[PDB]
Amino acid sequence: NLWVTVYYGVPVWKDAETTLFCASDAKAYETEKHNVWATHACVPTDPNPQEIHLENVTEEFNMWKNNMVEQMHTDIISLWDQSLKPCVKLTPLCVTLQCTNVTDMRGELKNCSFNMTTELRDKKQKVYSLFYRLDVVQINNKEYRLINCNTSAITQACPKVSFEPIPIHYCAPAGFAILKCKDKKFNGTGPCPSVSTVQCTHGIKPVVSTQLLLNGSLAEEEVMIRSENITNNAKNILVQFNTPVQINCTRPNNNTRKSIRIGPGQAFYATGDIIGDIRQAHCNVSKATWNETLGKVVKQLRKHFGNNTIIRFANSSGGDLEVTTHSFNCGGEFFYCNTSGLFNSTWISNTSVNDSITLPCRIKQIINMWQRIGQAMYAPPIQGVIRCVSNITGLILTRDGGSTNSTTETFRPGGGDMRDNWRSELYKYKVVKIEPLGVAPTRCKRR
Amino acid sequence: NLWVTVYYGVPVWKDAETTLFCASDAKAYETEKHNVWATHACVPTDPNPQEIHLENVTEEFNMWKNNMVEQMHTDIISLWDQSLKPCVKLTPLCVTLQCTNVTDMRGELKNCSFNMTTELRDKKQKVYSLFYRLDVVQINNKEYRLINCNTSAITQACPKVSFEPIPIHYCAPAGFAILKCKDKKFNGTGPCPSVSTVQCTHGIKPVVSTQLLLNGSLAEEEVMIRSENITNNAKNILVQFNTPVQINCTRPNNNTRKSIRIGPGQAFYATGDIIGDIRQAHCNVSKATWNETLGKVVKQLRKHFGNNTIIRFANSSGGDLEVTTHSFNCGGEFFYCNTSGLFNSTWISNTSVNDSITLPCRIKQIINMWQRIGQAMYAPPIQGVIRCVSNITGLILTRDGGSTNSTTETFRPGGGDMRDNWRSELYKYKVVKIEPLGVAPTRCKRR
Amino acid sequence: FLGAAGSTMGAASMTLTVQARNLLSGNPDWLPDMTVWGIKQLQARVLAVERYLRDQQLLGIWGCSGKLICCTNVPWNSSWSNRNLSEIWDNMTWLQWDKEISNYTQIIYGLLEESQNQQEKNEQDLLALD
Amino acid sequence: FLGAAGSTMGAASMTLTVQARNLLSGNPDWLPDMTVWGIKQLQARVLAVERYLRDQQLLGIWGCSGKLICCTNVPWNSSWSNRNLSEIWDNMTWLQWDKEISNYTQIIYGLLEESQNQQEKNEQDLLALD
Amino acid sequence: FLGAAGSTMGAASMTLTVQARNLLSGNPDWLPDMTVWGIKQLQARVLAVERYLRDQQLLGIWGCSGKLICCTNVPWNSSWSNRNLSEIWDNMTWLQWDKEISNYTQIIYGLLEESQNQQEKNEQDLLALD
Ligand SMILES: *[C@@H]1O[C@H](CO)[C@@H](O[C@@H]2O[C@H](CO)[C@@H](O[C@@H]3O[C@H](CO[C@H]4O[C@H](CO[C@H]5O[C@H](CO)[C@@H](O)[C@H](O)[C@@H]5O)[C@@H](O)[C@H](O[C@H]5O[C@H](CO)[C@@H](O)[C@H](O)[C@@H]5O)[C@@H]4O)[C@@H](O)[C@H](O[C@H]4O[C@H](CO)[C@@H](O)[C@H](O)[C@@H]4O[C@H]4O[C@H](CO)[C@@H](O)[C@H](O)[C@@H]4O)[C@@H]3O)[C@H](O)[C@H]2NC(C)=O)[C@H](O)[C@H]1NC(C)=O
Ligand SMILES: *[C@@H]1O[C@H](CO)[C@@H](O[C@@H]2O[C@H](CO)[C@@H](O[C@@H]3O[C@H](CO[C@H]4O[C@H](CO[C@H]5O[C@H](CO)[C@@H](O)[C@H](O)[C@@H]5O)[C@@H](O)[C@H](O[C@H]5O[C@H](CO)[C@@H](O)[C@H](O)[C@@H]5O)[C@@H]4O)[C@@H](O)[C@H](O[C@H]4O[C@H](CO)[C@@H](O)[C@H](O)[C@@H]4O[C@H]4O[C@H](CO)[C@@H](O)[C@H](O)[C@@H]4O)[C@@H]3O)[C@H](O)[C@H]2NC(C)=O)[C@H](O)[C@H]1NC(C)=O
Ligand SMILES: *[C@@H]1O[C@H](CO)[C@@H](O[C@@H]2O[C@H](CO)[C@@H](O[C@@H]3O[C@H](CO)[C@@H](O)[C@H](O[C@H]4O[C@H](CO)[C@@H](O)[C@H](O)[C@@H]4O[C@H]4O[C@H](CO)[C@@H](O)[C@H](O)[C@@H]4O)[C@@H]3O)[C@H](O)[C@H]2NC(C)=O)[C@H](O)[C@H]1NC(C)=O
Ligand SMILES: *[C@@H]1O[C@H](CO)[C@@H](O[C@@H]2O[C@H](CO)[C@@H](O[C@@H]3O[C@H](CO)[C@@H](O)[C@H](O[C@H]4O[C@H](CO)[C@@H](O)[C@H](O)[C@@H]4O[C@H]4O[C@H](CO)[C@@H](O)[C@H](O)[C@@H]4O)[C@@H]3O)[C@H](O)[C@H]2NC(C)=O)[C@H](O)[C@H]1NC(C)=O
Ligand SMILES: *[C@@H]1O[C@H](CO)[C@@H](O[C@@H]2O[C@H](CO)[C@@H](O[C@@H]3O[C@H](CO[C@H]4O[C@H](CO)[C@@H](O)[C@H](O)[C@@H]4O)[C@@H](O)[C@H](O[C@H]4O[C@H](CO)[C@@H](O)[C@H](O)[C@@H]4O)[C@@H]3O)[C@H](O)[C@H]2NC(C)=O)[C@H](O)[C@H]1NC(C)=O
Ligand SMILES: *[C@@H]1O[C@H](CO)[C@@H](O[C@@H]2O[C@H](CO)[C@@H](O[C@@H]3O[C@H](CO[C@H]4O[C@H](CO)[C@@H](O)[C@H](O)[C@@H]4O)[C@@H](O)[C@H](O[C@H]4O[C@H](CO)[C@@H](O)[C@H](O)[C@@H]4O)[C@@H]3O)[C@H](O)[C@H]2NC(C)=O)[C@H](O)[C@H]1NC(C)=O
Ligand SMILES: *[C@@H]1O[C@H](CO)[C@@H](O[C@@H]2O[C@H](CO)[C@@H](O[C@@H]3O[C@H](CO)[C@@H](O)[C@H](O)[C@@H]3O)[C@H](O)[C@H]2NC(C)=O)[C@H](O)[C@H]1NC(C)=O
Ligand SMILES: *[C@@H]1O[C@H](CO)[C@@H](O[C@@H]2O[C@H](CO)[C@@H](O[C@@H]3O[C@H](CO)[C@@H](O)[C@H](O)[C@@H]3O)[C@H](O)[C@H]2NC(C)=O)[C@H](O)[C@H]1NC(C)=O
Ligand SMILES: *[C@@H]1O[C@H](CO)[C@@H](O[C@@H]2O[C@H](CO)[C@@H](O)[C@H](O)[C@H]2NC(C)=O)[C@H](O)[C@H]1NC(C)=O
Numbered sequence A, B: 001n002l003w004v005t006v007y008y009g010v011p012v013w014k015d016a017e018t019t020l021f022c023a024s025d026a027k028a029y030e031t032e033k034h035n036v037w038a039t040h041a042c043v044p045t046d047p048n049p050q051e052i053h054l055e056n057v058t059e060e061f062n063m064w065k066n067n068m069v070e071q072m073h074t075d076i077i078s079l080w081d082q083s084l085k086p087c088v089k090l091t092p093l094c095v096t097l098q099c100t101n102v103t104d105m106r107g108e109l110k111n112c113s114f115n116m117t118t119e120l121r122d123k124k125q126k127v128y129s130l131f132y133r134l135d136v137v138q139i140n141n142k143e144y145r146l147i148n149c150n151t152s153a154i155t156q157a158c159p160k161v162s163f164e165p166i167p168i169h170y171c172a173p174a175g176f177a178i179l180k181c182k183d184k185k186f187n188g189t190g191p192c193p194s195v196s197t198v199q200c201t202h203g204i205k206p207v208v209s210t211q212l213l214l215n216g217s218l219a220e221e222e223v224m225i226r227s228e229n230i231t232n233n234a235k236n237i238l239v240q241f242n243t244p245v246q247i248n249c250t251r252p253n254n255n256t257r258k259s260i261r262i263g264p265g266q267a268f269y270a271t272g273d274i275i276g277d278i279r280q281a282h283c284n285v286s287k288a289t290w291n292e293t294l295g296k297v298v299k300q301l302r303k304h305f306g307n308n309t310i311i312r313f314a315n316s317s318g319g320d321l322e323v324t325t326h327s328f329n330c331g332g333e334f335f336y337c338n339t340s341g342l343f344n345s346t347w348i349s350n351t352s353v354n355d356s357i358t359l360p361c362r363i364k365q366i367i368n369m370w371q372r373i374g375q376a377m378y379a380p381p382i383q384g385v386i387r388c389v390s391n392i393t394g395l396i397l398t399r400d401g402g403s404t405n406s407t408t409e410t411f412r413p414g415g416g417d418m419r420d421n422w423r424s425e426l427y428k429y430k431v432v433k434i435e436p437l438g439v440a441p442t443r444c445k446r447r
Numbered sequence C, D, E: 001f002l003g004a005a006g007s008t009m010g011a012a013s014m015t016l017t018v019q020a021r022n023l024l025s026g027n028p029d030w031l032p033d034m035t036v037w038g039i040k041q042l043q044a045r046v047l048a049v050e051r052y053l054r055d056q057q058l059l060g061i062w063g064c065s066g067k068l069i070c071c072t073n074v075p076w077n078s079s080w081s082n083r084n085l086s087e088i089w090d091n092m093t094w095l096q097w098d099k100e101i102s103n104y105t106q107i108i109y110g111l112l113e114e115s116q117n118q119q120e121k122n123e124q125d126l127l128a129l130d
């Protein structure tokens, strides 16, 4: 009896992948400071982002299969190179370094004398600088060299731009949509009872860190435990905190900028003498706040590893510095902190057997993150003492393979892949494409 | 009774801003000479530009609020960098210069000996060149250096391309329109009785000059006087001439090109010895023609400053060379002329109390215009004597602040902002966006 | 080309086609482009087609589905420019017209997409069945 | 915005207009772009208009020629989801609906462009002559 | 696909739909692009959509407002290819046909946009009022 009829705009979608753009909230642009991080031409965010809750809908999510992570990961990487392209390349810094021990703590800093090319190509320049032990390597008084020269080339980051993370909303173009999981407890896998849609994702700060998720999103009620394959010890375990952890990372060295001239037109910023406290970089964590969280977190692992079992914590096993330490950026400088003091504990079924704690941190200006070869970035010196306060919102953890599985299990800080850091904020999001065209049988026919 | 009805294409527009492109008249492309100025991919101009006169229409214009100026100003700037990018960079020219006085007029030219890198990286090259006093600065026989080396880097303009200004029509994309003011007397502010529309603006030659508008558009009937804020002495005063003023600027030095080889593959063009008249660059203005204009112009100022008053003229007060002199380009070289001789006069109410006049001009190859730091352009030497004839179509003027306002007023040549130069041709133009959609009540309804 | 903008709305209906033509399509058209100033001749014409399809959606979702003029079942409210018919077309101009309707412009828009093509096409489906 | 996706097809017909709107047009709209990350904000929106005109061809070449809903002379085959009318709109959902028709989807498409607007317009030409 | 180009105009009307399809939409479609040779795979497809909307304006502003075939009230002038009906469709081919009309092509175009949809829609407005 009936007849076919074309309906346009029916609620039908399929899971797919597209190219997502950013959103800066149109305030980051007023923050200026010559293109901070991403925001330059960055899409300002709709003042009123729209979130529509879909009733009577259940959708299955997988955060580990999420494509927004891979795009974001490649975005930061592509973003990094574009920042270093217009800046000043440090290529003729491979000159011999004659170094000596700084005036305590086994001479971590080296005072190095070397020859340099001036604006003119005729006469050289005899000048000295100050490099960390991590930035230099001796070759056989004490003679050193740049640590990256044998591996690759090097370029200096511009002092105008800042590495300051700013909120970035990922949005989808026309024909696409972004799904948001509104449940309080979600491990990133399984069906999602309450699903809402948004044009733009929430504020996401691209904070690059290791062993500690900084400035991230808090969980709801109970703390969350996420892992790709849990019984598998080869897979990292992502944790989401309820309450934020106060962390202080400072640069207890009050410095000055040389701004030496290697012209014509170019000026390099050398690290001058340190005026102030003679100290190594340090990281503070309040003993009461970390413990309280630990007691709550260690109980969540027993929802899997069993009601009663012994959970012991320990510092990093070994590997690259990026893996073994907490790597991040504060005030433009890159800190590498020793977390061994926090991870020293042993817990009972519900319990573990002072007013403050500190963590030794190391500073490295010349870095290759993401296993990049051919390009090394030099972090420019900062005037004065740098102080920063951030939230610790989560961790990257790995389980040991030694078993004795039915006895006890030990967990250690993870590292490596930075996608996990983005999976922390993107677990509730996935990309689907909308299929508007539809057909239905009805009597109307046509004349 | 009636019913609403959608009308499409109704004559309704709103003032707005868009991105405008160029037009080259499709002849400039046949002029070739490897991308002269702008025209490379430049839009050829419609052989028949369309100008439609709108009857019974009055629109209010402001030339100082015009956005076509800001775009054009940023265009020339962006155009300038793209021309210097593929060319040869002069970076290792900062070598010490041993200079001596040329064989009259207090030794304006310096014969400089210096060391240079050859195609090979082994042996240097002992060679001499000839630089103007303005291009070099001594540092403490006579030893000199490049004047830009302490400030910035430097790059040479390619001899293939030419700086020759070519007519450029600014046009608007679909959805936009360009308004043209057809009145004979318009100061750039107030209502415009007769308004016509065009797809493309008229022929506009991007001639960059100071204290003198060269190769511009003539006024109609009376000469025109334009100022942003007139009683305000801080605002420049733009003047539009009726009859064009004959001006001659020549390079009375017959030169040769060295074309030295700083390989591999690169060749620099040095300034060789001068064969011919021993002279300084000079600018000619006919005494009769300048005066006649002056008598007509000085009367227009009395339509504001009052019927009777004393108007005295004087040369530039002081400042940067770009401000204090007339800066332009002829034959590829950049002249800086001394206008002090023309601006020496004193006028009565209608009058002022030989066959020719001349103006001392200075030449500078290394220039930073538009207050640019980090990039300095070297103007390549030209074979033979350069001669050029242009029209003087207008001025940039400033009024003194010293008052004694009710007594007399003195005017001096302005400078600085190059937007004023573009405001001279764009005063009759502004950008609006068309809004085609409209609704009107009618009986037709629908079945 | 806009010649009747100063003229009355009644006279402005004759040249309506001219505005539709020139406005609609604008191609110079030049293939050549370069990294800088090629992106400038792109950004302008890309915004042209984005602004265009924006207008076309309204023409389709409303009771038009066709260009130039089309009518609708929305009754003209008295509160919306209460006027004389000869006071609109014969004595008044479009720029002068759009000036007053500015307050009711968004209201009328709702009557076209919702009150008509949402409720009209559904009405049509119910009337085309029998 | 997709709110009735969980609801029945009968209820999903009321908010149909909302999906048409938001889906159709998406301009942020920002002119600024750069050599890298400018090509990223381009590649996305260019694919948007390519996917769009792809859909629009079907609307035109079929018996619609207009947006939202339009009907046709193609009889509904029993072999295609043999069902109850109240079992479709009242008891069933679109996602659940498109799930079954997946096999006959390409067949129906042929009936719209070939069996109708190819044979209908030609039929119209023969019926409009007299 | 163009198969009837050699065949007569009468036979060329059957496969008309095929030409409409393939011509209309052409997406490879590949997202990847680079600074050079990415601008080459752009410049081609951008000119494709510019040439396309150019054609679509004529379809709308004329008496069609729909694709494939549509008719009009413009009478065929004798001075325009005075011929036999069987001498056109049955005995003649399109390429051979467009060859002769080349002189009157621009004239006919005027009759569609001006003589019809300018004067027809206005006529419709006057006939829809009563
Ligand atoms: C995510 O991570 C998790 C963990 O972190 C991963 O889980 C891992 O999954 C793999 C599967 O790929 C498992 O390996 C498979 O194990 C099964 C089962 O083996 C257990 O049971 C056997 C039988 O048990 C019954 O019978 C006895 C006797 O009556 C009873 O007492 C019992 O109570 C039970 O009732 C038993 O034989 C097994 O013991 C043997 O193996 C273990 C493990 O190596 C040894 O320690 C023992 O000493 C002993 O040797 C075990 O207890 C096996 O059946 C699978 O074998 C298949 O695959 C082999 C390749 O790995 C292949 O060589 C075999 O031939 C066999 O393939 C056969 O079966 C196929 C399917 O039918 C046929 O197609 C095929 O042709 C052939 O016939 C396999 O070894 C891991 O155990 C499991 N991890 C852990 C810790 O348990 C998961 O994979 C990850 N996933 C992702 C997506 O990341
Ligand atoms: C373009 O350029 C032009 C010029 O090139 C610019 O024009 C300039 O515009 C500014 C306005 O921003 C003017 O300043 C303002 O002047 C007025 C008027 O001042 C004059 O008259 C006063 C009264 O005159 C009458 O009364 C006497 C007594 O009976 C009679 O004899 C007279 O004949 C008159 O009838 C008089 O008091 C003034 O003299 C004082 O000021 C001058 C100038 O500084 C001194 O030389 C004198 O010695 C004497 O001190 C003068 O003669 C003032 O009223 C304005 O003051 C307001 O703004 C001040 C900030 O500048 C602020 O501190 C004051 O409190 C005051 O604000 C009051 O009024 C506001 C408005 O009602 C209130 O909101 C506010 O709360 C407060 O109550 C101001 O000083 C410039 O004079 C003028 N330039 C010239 C050369 O005249 C123009 O701005 C430019 N525009 C653009 C877009 O570029
Ligand atoms: C990382 O760094 C951050 C920032 O430094 C740390 O967070 C801060 O922690 C401190 C101490 O834990 C805390 O300081 C107190 O804040 C109170 C308000 O919240 C203040 O009222 C208080 O000031 C009193 O004490 C000071 C020291 O004793 C006095 O110098 C001061 O004058 C105050 O005394 C007054 O008040 C008393 C009555 O209470 C009155 O009798 C007196 O007359 C006088 O009026 C402290 O300064 C900061 O508030 C914290 N900051 C934030 C942002 O939370 C964090 O602990 C660090 N983490 C680690 C691991 O080190
Ligand atoms: C900037 O430079 C420009 C260009 O040089 C200047 O503009 C030129 O100005 C000159 C003089 O002011 C002018 O030259 C005259 O042009 C006339 C035509 O317009 C010529 O007829 C004339 O030639 C006669 O005079 C010459 C010198 O006396 C002789 O050499 C020549 O043979 C001519 O004589 C003949 O004619 C007489 C009768 O008149 C006859 O009896 C003789 O037998 C013989 O046949 C001049 O050359 C140029 O025309 C101007 N050029 C332009 C383009 O306008 C400008 O003045 C300069 N400005 C400044 C400030 O210096
Ligand atoms: C995790 O999140 C925390 C909190 O958001 C981040 O901490 C931020 O750290 C940045 C520095 O990297 C801070 O930026 C600083 O802002 C200070 C305050 O600026 C206001 O006040 C001044 C007046 O003093 C106003 O003029 C100004 O407009 C602002 O309203 C500045 O004083 C700072 O400048 C000084 O410090 C920097 C280095 O820190 C030096 O380079 C400067 O030269 C100068 O000495 C600086 O601009 C920011 O304010 C901090 N957040 C908050 C809320 O305070 C962590 O950095 C982040 N973690 C990571 C890894 O990014
Ligand atoms: C204001 O406007 C005036 C007038 O438009 C400009 O003056 C122009 O100056 C340029 C030079 O910058 C002139 O270009 C010159 O054209 C001459 C004539 O070319 C014709 O004749 C030759 C035969 O001789 C033909 O083969 C050719 O196809 C043309 O038909 C050339 O002879 C010139 O070459 C010589 O001079 C230049 C430097 O001037 C040298 O570099 C060359 O190597 C060679 O020695 C040159 O090509 C142009 O002709 C002038 N205009 C007019 C109308 O003559 C002003 O420059 C302008 N002001 C500013 C600031 O731009
Ligand atoms: C590690 O976490 C434990 C909680 O599991 C912390 O124990 C806390 O210890 C303080 C004392 O230092 C307790 O405060 C006490 O409160 C009672 C009741 O008001 C009062 O009688 C005592 O005089 C004292 O003030 C606190 O209650 C207790 N926490 C809980 C949950 O009971 C411990 O402080 C943490 N580690 C560190 C660094 O102390
Ligand atoms: C400055 O401008 C004035 C005009 O305001 C110029 O005065 C001009 O002087 C010439 C003489 O050199 C005048 O020509 C004369 O013409 C009369 C009448 O034909 C004749 O009798 C004389 O023998 C002589 O030929 C000219 O008329 C006069 N201008 C005007 C408008 O009257 C003056 O020349 C200019 N400055 C210079 C450089 O001379
Ligand atoms: C790092 O070593 C340099 C020398 O290579 C020190 O600079 C010298 O400082 C002394 C002060 O005791 C001066 O008398 C010399 O003239 C300095 N020489 C040069 C070349 O600068 C420098 O002081 C050392 N580090 C610091 C600043 O503590």
Ligand SMILES: *[C@@H]1O[C@H](CO)[C@@H](O[C@@H]2O[C@H](CO)[C@@H](O)[C@H](O)[C@H]2NC(C)=O)[C@H](O)[C@H]1NC(C)=O
Residues within 6 Å of the ligand: A338, A339, A340, A341
């Ligand atoms: C990070 O912290 C741990 C724990 O304090 C440090 O381990 C010490 O290592 C030294 C040798 O380098 C031993 O002499 C100490 O006995 C160790 N301490 C303890 C408590 O066992 C470690 O050195 C720190 N830093 C690094 C880079 O390893």
Ligand SMILES: *[C@@H]1O[C@H](CO)[C@@H](O[C@@H]2O[C@H](CO)[C@@H](O)[C@H](O)[C@H]2NC(C)=O)[C@H](O)[C@H]1NC(C)=O
Residues within 6 Å of the ligand: B338, B339, B340, B341
């Ligand atoms: C520009 O022209 C003026 C006017 O001729 C020059 O002023 C002369 O300056 C010198 C000193 O440099 C004095 O000795 C002369 O007496 C001045 N001339 C007059 C007429 O007063 C000026 O030097 C010229 N150039 C520059 C660069 O200033």
Ligand SMILES: *[C@@H]1O[C@H](CO)[C@@H](O)[C@H](O)[C@H]1NC(C)=O
Residues within 6 Å of the ligand: A101, A106, A107, A108
């Ligand atoms: C300087 O300190 C280092 C420790 O890193 C030590 O190995 C070296 O022997 C010291 N040099 C001198 C001269 O004491």
Ligand SMILES: *[C@@H]1O[C@H](CO)[C@@H](O)[C@H](O)[C@H]1NC(C)=O
Residues within 6 Å of the ligand: B101, B106, B107, B108
């Ligand atoms: C060369 O001329 C300059 C004038 O610029 C003068 O200062 C200098 O003393 C002269 N040198 C000699 C050696 O005469």
Ligand SMILES: *[C@@H]1O[C@H](CO)[C@@H](O)[C@H](O)[C@H]1NC(C)=O
Residues within 6 Å of the ligand: D075, D077, D078, D079
């Ligand atoms: C319905 O479909 C079957 C098989 O798909 C076919 O045999 C039959 O002819 C079709 N009927 C109509 C009316 O299309």
